[PDB]
Design a protein around this ligand. Structure first.
Ligand code: NI
Ligand code: NI
Lengths: 30, 21, 30, 21, 30, 30, 21, 21, 30, 21, 30, 21
């Protein structure tokens, strides 16, 4: 797999693909 | 963190896998 | 106006929209 | 869960906030 | 709900979520 | 080559693609 | 409407231009 | 207008709601 | 964790994710 | 083909690499 | 049709719409 | 190539059509 440059909604997309189903936590810096 | 790294730098699907439930 | 169906990647896009920098969890097994 | 509330059934943008951090 | 930074297709996505069904007008400056 | 089905957010993405700066209306009740 | 033309049935990118501004 | 504001500045879902039919 | 269904635009997003700069082919008639 | 492997059935991210360049 | 400014996943989206079904090759520079 | 042109410059759907199978 290749490395990724991912901003905004595009990261959440990637998380969804990588995880499905297991689900994931989206946790940006405050 | 991961969100910032993927956007400002680069990240792997393997790093992303750490955020799966 | 009745509400809409949100599944899969479309559901997590909508979570990103609503939650943004607060972050979120997507846990379909729950 | 969210899939049942928002995918199988329908949900509002307000319901979606139930799953914020 | 949080504030949004939205460019290109990402704005139309947001409009679609916010509106459904009611529909919407996408009206960029000329 | 026969045409494709476009629904929901995918339909409005395609409208954005085709129309761009002209803008568009998405009115499913019509 | 567009949903019937493009979702229930199929439509071309040319048909989609019917709904430009 | 709204399109330009959301992209160059920031906008709320409440502002976007003004563009619903 | 069982795998997920990827169709249409969602399938090509996932191909882009996995392949990136290597590039890819999407050939549904095959 | 990919549609049968990944859409009709299910496939892994590893299977998807079968269609890289 | 209008001209397009398209980066990342957004280009693959556009390719998918334009082509369906015929499929396409995504072929970025190395 | 096409990928770079659409991103750094602009491109038409007609240019994209050359990449269909
Ligand atoms: Ni979809
Ligand atoms: Ni984008």
């Amino acid at each position: 797999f290749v490395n990724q440059h991912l901003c905004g909604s595009h990261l959440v997309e990637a998380l969804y693909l990588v995880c499905g189903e297991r689900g994931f936590f989206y946790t940006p810096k405050t | 963190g991961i969100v910032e790294q993927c956007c400002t730098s680069i990240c792997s699907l393997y790093q992303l896998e750490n955020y799966c439930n």
